[PDB]
Design an enzyme around this catalytic site. Structure first.
Site, PDB file in Angstrom:
ATOM      1  N   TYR B 158       0.834  -1.194   0.000  1.00 15.09           N
ATOM      2  CA  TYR B 158       0.000   0.000   0.000  1.00 15.09           C
ATOM      3  C   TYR B 158       0.867   1.240   0.000  1.00 15.09           C
ATOM      4  O   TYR B 158       1.632   1.487   0.951  1.00 15.09           O
ATOM      5  CB  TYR B 158      -0.987   0.044   1.177  1.00 15.09           C
ATOM      6  CG  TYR B 158      -1.839   1.288   1.134  1.00 15.09           C
ATOM      7  CD1 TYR B 158      -2.909   1.388   0.242  1.00 15.09           C
ATOM      8  CD2 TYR B 158      -1.533   2.391   1.924  1.00 15.09           C
ATOM      9  CE1 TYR B 158      -3.683   2.551   0.178  1.00 15.09           C
ATOM     10  CE2 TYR B 158      -2.304   3.564   1.863  1.00 15.09           C
ATOM     11  CZ  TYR B 158      -3.369   3.628   0.982  1.00 15.09           C
ATOM     12  OH  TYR B 158      -4.124   4.779   0.904  1.00 15.09           O
ATOM     13  N   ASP B 239       9.282   2.935   1.111  1.00 15.66           N
ATOM     14  CA  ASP B 239       8.130   3.694   1.562  1.00 15.66           C
ATOM     15  C   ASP B 239       8.110   3.628   3.085  1.00 15.66           C
ATOM     16  O   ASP B 239       7.703   2.617   3.657  1.00 15.66           O
ATOM     17  CB  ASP B 239       6.852   3.099   0.945  1.00 15.66           C
ATOM     18  CG  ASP B 239       5.595   3.839   1.377  1.00 15.66           C
ATOM     19  OD1 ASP B 239       5.638   4.588   2.372  1.00 15.66           O
ATOM     20  OD2 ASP B 239       4.559   3.666   0.715  1.00 15.66           O
ATOM     21  N   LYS B 266       2.325  11.104   6.851  1.00 19.19           N
ATOM     22  CA  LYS B 266       1.536  10.987   8.098  1.00 19.19           C
ATOM     23  C   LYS B 266       2.071  11.963   9.195  1.00 19.19           C
ATOM     24  O   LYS B 266       1.974  13.181   9.021  1.00 19.19           O
ATOM     25  CB  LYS B 266       1.345   9.506   8.470  1.00 19.19           C
ATOM     26  CG  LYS B 266       0.323   8.940   7.437  1.00 19.19           C
ATOM     27  CD  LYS B 266      -0.279   7.619   7.885  1.00 19.19           C
ATOM     28  CE  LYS B 266      -1.289   7.017   6.895  1.00 19.19           C
ATOM     29  NZ  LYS B 266      -0.624   6.005   6.040  1.00 19.19           N
TER      30      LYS B 266
END
Ligand SMILES: *Cc1c(COP(=O)(O)O)cnc(C)c1O
Ligand SMILES: *Cc1c(COP(=O)(O)O)cnc(C)c1O
Lengths: 433, 433
Positions: B158, B239, B266
């Site tokens: 993801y 990532d 985030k």
């Protein structure tokens, strides 16, 4: 004029450099950690960009203490100016209720409803974190809805950081199956959309191109896109990230043309990070988590600060009435500037609609980026540096953007500065026929 | 058993519905304007999601006034909790200096430097508006840098809203040329990367998969990726949008594996919209506007509120030391939970690293999402509703996320709630053996 322009530009670089030593020092230090000290390409210009230290209303201050009247306003995002209390107070109130709320919240629905009501071609929407994300999602929706792959876009088109077009897609453009057609060419659009009809999922277009130079889409061209898209079974998507501001209900509604989806961004989030895509409920149903096949995930999409700021801005400040009034003020300015250029006999004009316009050093009708490909960029630079000298902060590309706090006196200063530019650079500027 | 689980779930739905009428009213109203009332797919769950009205520290209140201890914390973005004064004061101070500043500013460089110092594999970076944009830009950079097109990713990977993978690219995933390989299969990774060597621009991987269920990447596998990428001339991109929080200097540094680029997001923006991509200066040079061939645009990338909040959060609250300490608290919790499950003989476990873990109703080693293919989704729902009954707000998917304001007593309550879950649902839960 070639050699004289080179000399004038060298003089301008020197004057700018001498006037802005703190900005130069800041640039040199920041270049250690970001390529060319830069995180948004449009903000860089030679010999180095000014660091902006402060903003208040339609005023900006640089690191060396210069105050400017702001005629760029965050590339249209900053319609409220730099310090609107309605925005700041809404954000403070949101923060006091708690941030990062990790669920559906009490603010997102207010902003969603407002947008659907103000832009009724949007029956349902979803929020994103940028205009780029909004356009990516709209394209994704159309590919899935139609079961087709080809995407029609237009040269000069700008749809975000990974969706930009010259005659071919830009080097950073995502590798969808793009068919790139000339803007404002209805005959080619009809012929090519017909030729590739069964493969075309979507036609994506700005109703006035922004980045390419404030180039209005001609009604016969935009209608051709609607007519051809319906004929072949493609979705029409209007990118109104910029053009939604141009009339009380945006430019597509002003023109009476209905797209299947619409994308929004920039000022709609009240000055905060924002995008949205929406349109037909039956297309948006693809994303209904109860029944639709498409996920649309993101972290900051419904954040309370953006939701609060957007709602406060659109209800208290940039209302439908205010959008109309700002448009009128912009039309008056553009008319004054074009009359001045014509009276002075220079090949200079300002193109656009309402509160958005762009200086160009060409004569004649500007209908596509092709008409501008030969413009001498050194003249754009001379204009930019001249405006700084006249206490006006603009964009290197000549893009002029009105915001709510800009006064009539500020607007007069802009016109006067164009007058003095022409008066002082008369030997360098191309002459009109 | 199957029938009994259906019955227990029907009961949970009813109790949830009856206890939350204000959230139900809000859902029905908001569904008019957003598909499924929703703008972030993960926030939807059946029969309808709770509306969150307020947050303070690590507490959340829903629209019906229920108070919960927050064990999801904005899917890791909310590491500071919901009301950190350090964040709020930084944002307020930034707003007072003016927003939408339309230039290089005095805050972006401070945060860029801080990030490069914290994660030294990042020599230079650029900011984006989301983790999705950061990954899109990292990929774009790698394709251009290498002159190749094929991208290796992993099953269950993801990387954002248009970069998701099951066994195949998800329906919303952008049509790059993706080669999807099994996570944690070193032998297949070496073989397939070598086999397609000249075509592979980039290998993109999470050092621990987040969304797929907090599945740690094994040392042998991650080292195989680094070695194979180097051998064939591809860039390795980690990532670390989630994993950067897992150790004082992020997970990749803890493991001792250097990627060519790293993406972040985030919590790094202090709870504000944020992403970043960076790494080798020679790759990032593609974006230097002075000399490089690539533009990277984006309106909100360097916005002063994000720049201020990010810097305040990382320096005052979530320091490298704090990241280490929170990771220790998480390791202790995960071990307590796994011991409890094993002692009770249930096929239930928690996978992950440090302050991030995920409940799974499966026995044995979890090495990829394939190991979770036969799990009963109804059990995750029963857990979720049970936790709500025990004053704990969690994620439907069983993802547990520690944040700084969570007390040792809050954590004790989580463990006790899993104990009561197992105690009350004994007959329904699969056995370890
Ligand atoms: C600015 C703009 C975008 C991109 O929005 P971002 O928030 O900068 O990603 C897309 N389309 C148009 C027409 C724009 O002007
Ligand atoms: C959340 C996440 C992303 C996407 O970030 P957004 O800001 O939601 O677009 C990408 N990668 C990982 C590993 C993530 O956890």
């Amino acid at each position: 004029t070639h050699a004289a322009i080179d000399q004038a530009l060298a003089d301008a670089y020197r004057r700018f450099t001498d006037a802005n030593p703190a900005s130069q020092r800041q640039f040199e230090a920041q270049a250690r950690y970001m390529p060319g000290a830069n995180s948004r390409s449009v903000l860089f210009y030679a010999p180095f960009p000014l660091t902006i230290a402060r903003g208040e209303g339609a005023a900006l201050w640089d690191a060396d203490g210069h105050r400017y009247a702001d005629f760029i306003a965050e590339y249209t995002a900053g319609v409220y100016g730099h310090s609107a209390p309605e925005i700041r107070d809404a954000v403070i109130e949101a923060m006091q209720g708690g941030i990062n709320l990790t669920g559906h919240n009490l603010l997102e629905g207010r902003l969603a409803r407002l947008i659907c009501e103000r832009f009724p071609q949007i029956e349902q929407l979803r929020f994103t974190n940028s205009g780029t994300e909004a356009n990516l999602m709209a394209l994704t929706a159309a590919l899935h809805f139609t079961g087709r792959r080809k995407i029609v876009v237009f040269s000069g088109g700008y749809h975000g950081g990974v969706l930009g077009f010259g005659a071919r897609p830009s080097p950073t453009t995502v590798p969808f199956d793009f068919l790139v057609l000339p803007y404002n060419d209805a005959q080619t659009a009809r012929a090519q959309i017909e030729r590739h009809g069964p493969e075309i999922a979507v036609v994506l277009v700005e109703p006035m191109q922004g980045a390419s130079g404030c180039i209005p889409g001609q009604p016969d061209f935009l209608q051709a896109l609607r007519e051809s898209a319906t004929q072949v079974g493609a979705l029409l998507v209007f990118d109104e990230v910029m053009t939604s501001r141009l009339a009380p209900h945006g430019l597509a509604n002003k023109l009476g043309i209905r797209s299947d989806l619409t994308t929004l961004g920039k000022y709609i989030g009240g000055g905060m990070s924002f995008g949205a895509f929406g349109g037909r409920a039956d297309v948006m149903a693809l994303f209904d988590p109860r029944t639709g096949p498409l996920a649309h995930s993101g972290t900051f999409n419904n954040n309370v600060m953006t939701m609060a700021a957007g709602y406060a801005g659109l209800t208290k400040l940039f209302t439908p009435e205010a959008a109309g009034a700002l448009a009128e003020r912009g039309e008056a300015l553009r008319a004054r500037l074009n009359a001045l250029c014509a009276n002075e006999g220079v090949a200079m004009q300002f193109t656009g609609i309402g509160s958005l316009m762009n200086a160009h050093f060409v004569q004649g009708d500007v209908r596509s980026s092709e008409d501008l490909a030969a413009v001498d960029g050194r003249l754009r630079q001379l204009l930019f540096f001249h405006l700084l000298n006249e206490d006006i902060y603009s964009s290197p590309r000549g893009f002029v953007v009105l915001s709510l706090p800009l006064t009539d006196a500020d607007i007069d200063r802009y016109v006067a500065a164009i007058g003095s530019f022409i008066g002082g650079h008369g030997a360098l500027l191309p002459r009109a026929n």
